Scaffold this active site. Structure first.
Site, PDB file in Angstrom:
ATOM      1  N   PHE C  27       0.830  -1.199   0.000  1.00 40.78           N
ATOM      2  CA  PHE C  27       0.000   0.000   0.000  1.00 40.78           C
ATOM      3  C   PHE C  27       0.870   1.256   0.000  1.00 40.78           C
ATOM      4  CE2 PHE C  27      -2.213   3.353   2.406  1.00 40.78           C
ATOM      5  CZ  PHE C  27      -3.294   3.554   1.574  1.00 40.78           C
ATOM      6  N   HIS C  28       1.969   1.197   0.747  1.00 48.20           N
ATOM      7  CA  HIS C  28       2.929   2.296   0.799  1.00 48.20           C
ATOM      8  C   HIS C  28       3.526   2.591  -0.570  1.00 48.20           C
ATOM      9  CE1 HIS C  28       6.467   4.691   1.591  1.00 48.20           C
ATOM     10  NE2 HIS C  28       7.240   3.708   1.171  1.00 48.20           N
ATOM     11  N   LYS C  29       4.010   1.548  -1.239  1.00 44.32           N
ATOM     12  CA  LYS C  29       4.580   1.695  -2.576  1.00 44.32           C
ATOM     13  C   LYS C  29       3.524   2.213  -3.547  1.00 44.32           C
ATOM     14  CE  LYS C  29       7.539  -1.283  -4.004  1.00 44.32           C
ATOM     15  NZ  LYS C  29       8.718  -0.400  -3.785  1.00 44.32           N
ATOM     16  N   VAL C  32       3.208   5.789  -3.024  1.00 48.83           N
ATOM     17  CA  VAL C  32       4.422   6.407  -3.549  1.00 48.83           C
ATOM     18  C   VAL C  32       4.293   6.636  -5.051  1.00 48.83           C
ATOM     19  CG1 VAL C  32       6.849   5.993  -4.115  1.00 48.83           C
ATOM     20  CG2 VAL C  32       6.028   5.604  -1.784  1.00 48.83           C
TER      21      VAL C  32
END
Lengths: 267, 336, 182, 315, 315
Positions: C27-29, C32
């Site tokens: 989810f972070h990527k 990003v």
DNA sequence: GGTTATAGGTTTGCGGACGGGGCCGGG
DNA sequence: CCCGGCCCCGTCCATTATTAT
RNA sequence: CUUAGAAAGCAAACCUAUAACCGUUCACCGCCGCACAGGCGG
């Protein structure tokens, strides 16, 4: 040939400080889980409240210490987990013995109370790094010491990566990881050997320094307790004495005078 | 009347043929204690206390110096004291049995099949001579070169190590070669061999042919052939023949002893063990039985007779006897 | 205004913790790549452990962008996903404040390298550092750039009745922006 | 005569000490933890032990072997075979009996093996029965346990094995020396107990050699070896006897002392373990009870009070 | 055939120190805490220990296994197997014996492995008995305990397990070196004591190499290895013997000193624990006693001059 | 809650019958 | 001096394989 | 005078390598700064 000379092993004394119990044994008898205590048994030929912490002191398992120390295939072999810590893979029979040996961390402070908890704790411990086990990595199944099942190119590539990793530890030094098809240990009456990798003085010293560094900054965080390593004394042992630092502390040598002992030779 | 006789550590097996019930032969009794013997049915013997044993003990207690069978036959005496009472006596055995394997000695002095003593002679003329190379070189040929050599062929180019151990090991390897079916080539070499050596035929007792026999007979053939070229007197024995090697095969003990300094290897003995395979039990092992316990021997007579027996024993003054073999057995009690 | 739920399907290979970590980092990527300071998250079933449900908050088209981009591609099977929908009308709010200590081993090594602290200062530093502890729910995140596995902690405000507009920084946790809690 | 008087036999109790198993039984079939039988476990000599549990299905006929871990050392104690003990006692001469022959037998008869151990002549009817009788040495301590063993460097058929081992051991045993069997040597083929095949006149020279050996045992004493054509046992109702050699009180004393000395100094180093005889209690038995020492130890006599019993008549 | 005098054996007492368990027995079936049976617990080697409670099911055949937590270290103390000690002593040549053959036997026979440690080759049935004998190393401190262990995955079969561990350990042990087995090397298969099968000229060569090795141990001394075609054991009545090599006093002194030296500096790093030998007391025993040092003797006196006992003679 | 995975589960050997010749004794 | 028995040494032999809730 | 009698199961071998009894393996590696102030990046 002849005899092996140089530094046989790198010993040390660890003195650490903390509060509360870092490592618990488990719940044993009305019942209590407890903490690891050396020499303690709950059986009478018992109540939780009867204990002498002087006779049966609190200690931290070498397993726990190692676990928090390292906090962590080709990648396994090139990891510090592979080189310093040991490993076993149940499939087939591939393993490596840890050159790192650690005694218990024994609390000198007698503060207990009815879970059974702890106040201020001061741990004392000893340890050693074996150059013989560290400098050599057995890749051959002959003696069943085999680290991995390898290809001739995998042999050379593995040596290379380890050289790279060990290099990444201390840029000033220039380590060598040398693969060979036959490595014979000093003292055999026959010439029989295993395919493997020998590490040069710079590599071995780099690994030792890395281990000692991890030991000096070693800290463990438990829910209601913690430990940090306060002081560390290091001895480079070229003698035949084991734990020279433990029995006699007047003979200790802090800085390395001699090159590391070479226990193996290519043939 | 009762005699309570307690015993410890007694051998419950017997290793001999013939009988202790009858005069011992000039050459003694046949010994089968060997594993080869014990494999054969009937050679393995388990013993228990019998009337013979008990009566032997009684006669021992009255001080008879004669063997039991001599006492029963009234050999050197007038009457046999127990002749009347022997039918009147019973016994109750309370053994504790232990199964132990024990190393027993073999006195027949049988030479070991595979073994030798002393030092090996590499200086023996048969190895170091001129004819030696093309003589012993026969055994090193493969089966086809050997089959061709059997007929008229004088060519052996084989250059091999000359050692008694090398030769005997080569024979070891040639003997473990699998048997061969009878065919054209085998027929022709069989006919030629039977032509040169009629007295023996090359076949198994049951339906087989072996390479080692053909090899050995080829060595004999070479011995016969090279006799014209050189002197074979050094290569053969008194009343000549190849040492340790027959025409149908070879024997290691004779060969080695011939080429080794010192006598043949004597078999000093062997453990007492029998490993047999029984259906559903699989592997079963049988060891020597050692029994320790007490034996109540009951003699039914008048109290007066019992007292007579008792004072007879007291007058004899016998003490500390074995029981049946190699034991320590004493008389615990006497009841009238 | 729009939210999506992702429920972890527990597996013999990956237990709820590891799944949570990996889907969180994925989810972070995702965020990003999507470069949005506006996409948030919460952990509805959290009860001393972040729980098995991860709820993403934001614009409907952005959530559609997430579903379509299939950020968490490998791990789709362990996951059960509801369609995007508008949040229920009666809803409380809370921020998500990542709780990180001002003390670390790297910072201590840094202070030693700067010549800023004494031998005894190291001891007091270590006692203050290991003396404190976080009972807060945490997750161990694997990384690439730093090449480390680090423990991140989560803390939330209590049932704020009104929303506060704010940024959602990187991983979707919001400091000062209240996400809908239901 | 009417009675037999003097010492009938010399009984004794042996107390020995040691460490580990000196005498092993061997590999024994036992069941592994997986249920399959494991054919490698070495077992020591245990008194009364069986590997069998019985309890089988009829159609199998099998025995259901015990686990290696199941042993009761109180019920089945460790012991040293009498065979082994005797072997190590006479171990100097162990291989000599194989070389025994009728002509060479002259050498055999005068020796510790001939007089004490007894002997056999291969392919011959010549024999002598051992006056020394010994039980097994039974361990009173009983510290055994399952001990695992392995080989370094490879995993093979030989690599992994096990034994039931022992710690410190204390043995108790009993034994006896028969004066009847010791003092008389039969040269006659009559009862088939014959020691040597004899030609007339050989009796006295053989007696002389015996005299030499027994004298060489204890120069202080004055032994007598007397050959005669007919020897009849005393307390017997039997009027028939054999040509042989009888030894006097001093000779018997020398032989007894030699035996007791060898027993007291007996030591065995075998299979990576050892045994030594610590203490020995001796009884010279003139009574009408055999192995008095075993039942009642209060009636025991340590020093020889009386003369040794004379079991025979000159003619 | 006179009695043998001089030093019969060299005994010693070993005091060692260490931490943790060096030598483990293995995993053992025990009952978990109130959870009945547990198939994984690792146990060290404990002398006299059994996992059985000696309580049984009768028909079921189940035997009641002990609790893992129940052990008395005073009654059943921790020990290190003689096998392990021997392994680590000779640990440099450990893998060499597997590769043995006739010339390979030539190389093995002259070595610390050949002369002191024993060996066997199954193929050619060649062997030598080890003159070195060692008792158990017994922990006198007795600090053990139940220690729980775990894996970080904390989910599966590796899961959680346990071991009985030890703290500071102090070992006491005894041992002996047999001059009889050390000083003589049998090259003949006659008595089945054969070291290596040899040719006529090879004997002296082998002896020479032996002499070279033993000399290489202690340059100060003057060892001699003497080959002969006939070597006879003291005490045989027929004087029958085998081809072999006898070592003189100086050689025996060299091997004994080498052995004692290896023993005194002995250290083992194994199973996450270590051992070093602290003290060693040595006694040269010319009397007939095994392990005199163990039995009470305050009075023992070892003289520099007293020679080693010679058990064999040339013929 | 799990309640050990992994291989290794012994290696070697353990005679004697039959025939011919020589020596010793008897007729 | 001849015949038969007995004793000693050389020669040539070789058969087999099963079991567990 | 019994199952004639005398009769080593002998020699050699590491149970060995790895693993927090616990909150989800893991409180990490750097950056701003005098900070053992407060924060930031992954």
């Amino acid at each position: 040939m002849q005899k092996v000379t140089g530094i046989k092993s790198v010993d040390f004394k660890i003195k650490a400080l903390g509060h509360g119990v870092v490592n618990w044994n488990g719940p044993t008898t009305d019942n209590h889980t407890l903490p690891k205590l050396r020499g303690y048994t709950n059986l009478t030929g018992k109540q939780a409240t009867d204990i002498n912490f002087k006779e049966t002191p609190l200690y931290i398992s070498q397993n726990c210490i190692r676990h928090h120390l390292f906090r962590e295939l080709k990648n396994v072999l090139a990891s510090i987990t592979g080189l310093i810590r040991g490993y076993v893979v149940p499939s087939s029979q591939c393993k490596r013995t840890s050159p790192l040996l650690l005694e218990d961390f024994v609390d000198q402070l007698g503060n207990g109370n009815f879970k059974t908890t702890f106040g201020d704790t001061e741990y004392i411990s000893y340890g050693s790094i074996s150059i013989e086990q560290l400098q050599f990595i057995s890749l051959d199944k002959k003696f069943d010491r085999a680290a991995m099942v390898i290809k001739e190119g995998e042999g050379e590539v593995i040596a290379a990566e380890l050289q790279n990793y060990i290099q990444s530890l201390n840029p000033s030094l220039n380590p060598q990881a040398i693969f060979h098809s036959n490595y014979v240990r000093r003292g055999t009456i026959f010439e029989e050997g295993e395919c493997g990798i020998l590490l040069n003085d710079d590599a071995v010293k780099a690994l030792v320094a890395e281990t000692l560094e991890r030991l000096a900054n070693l800290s463990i965080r438990q829910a209601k307790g913690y430990m940090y390593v306060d002081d560390i004394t290091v001895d480079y042992n070229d003698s035949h004495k084991m734990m020279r630092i433990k029995r006699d502390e007047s003979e200790i040598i802090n800085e390395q005078h001699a090159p590391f002992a070479q226990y193996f030779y290519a043939k | 009347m009762k005699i309570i006789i307690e015993y410890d550590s007694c051998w419950r097996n017997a290793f001999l043929g013939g009988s202790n019930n009858e005069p011992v032969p000039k050459k003694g009794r046949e010994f089968l204690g060997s594993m080869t013997s014990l494999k054969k049915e009937g050679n393995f013997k388990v013993c228990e206390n019998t009337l013979d044993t008990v009566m032997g003990v009684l006669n021992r207690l009255i001080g008879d110096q004669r063997k039991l069978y001599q006492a029963r036959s009234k050999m050197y005496e007038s009457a046999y004291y127990f002749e009347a009472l022997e039918d009147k006596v019973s016994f109750i055995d309370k053994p504790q049995l232990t199964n132990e394997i024990s190393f027993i000695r073999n006195m027949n002095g049988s030479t070991d099949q595979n073994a030798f003593t002393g030092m090996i002679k590499v200086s023996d003329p048969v190895f170091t001579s001129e004819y030696s190379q093309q003589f012993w070189g026969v055994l090193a040929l493969d089966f086809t070169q050997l089959c061709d050599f059997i007929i008229k062929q004088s060519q052996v180019v084989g250059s091999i190590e000359l050692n008694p151990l090398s030769i005997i090991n080569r024979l070891e390897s040639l003997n473990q070669e699998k048997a061969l079916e009878n065919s054209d080539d085998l027929a022709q070499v069989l006919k030629v061999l039977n032509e040169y050596f009629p007295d023996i035929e090359y076949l198994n007792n049951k339906g087989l042919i072996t390479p080692i026999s053909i090899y050995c007979s080829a060595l004999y053939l070479q011995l016969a052939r090279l006799e014209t070229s050189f002197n074979m007197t050094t290569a053969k024995t008194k009343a000549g023949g190849i040492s340790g090697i027959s025409k149908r095969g070879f024997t290691k003990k004779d060969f080695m002893d011939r080429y080794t300094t010192g006598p043949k290897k004597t078999i000093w003995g062997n453990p007492f063990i029998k490993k047999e395979k029984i259906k559903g039990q699989g592997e079963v092992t049988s060891m020597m039985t050692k029994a320790s316990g007490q034996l109540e021997i009951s003699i039914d007579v008048d109290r007066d007779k019992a007292q007579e027996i008792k004072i007879l024993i007291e007058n004899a003054g016998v003490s500390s006897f074995y029981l049946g073999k190699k034991g320590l057995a004493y008389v615990s009690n006497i009841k009238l | 205004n729009s939210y999506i739920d992702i429920r972890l399907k527990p597996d013999a290979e990956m237990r709820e913790a590891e799944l949570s970590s990996k889907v969180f980092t994925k989810f972070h990527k995702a965020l990003v790549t999507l470069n949005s300071h506006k996409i948030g998250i919460s952990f509805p079933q959290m009860k001393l452990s972040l729980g098995q449900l991860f709820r993403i908050h934001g614009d409907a088209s952005l959530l559609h962008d997430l579903q379509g981009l299939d950020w968490l591609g490998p791990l789709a099977g362990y996951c059960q996903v509801t369609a995007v929908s508008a949040v229920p009308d009666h809803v409380q709010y809370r921020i998500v404040s990542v709780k990180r200590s001002n003390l670390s081993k790297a910072k201590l090594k840094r202070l030693i390298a700067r010549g800023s602290i004494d031998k005894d200062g190291e001891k007091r530093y270590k006692v203050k550092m290991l003396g404190q502890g976080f009972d807060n729910p945490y997750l161990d995140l694997f990384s690439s750039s730093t090449g480390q596995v680090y423990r991140k902690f989560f803390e939330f405000s209590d049932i704020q009745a009104h929303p506060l507009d704010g940024e959602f920084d990187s991983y979707g946790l919001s400091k000062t922006a209240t996400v809908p809690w239901f």
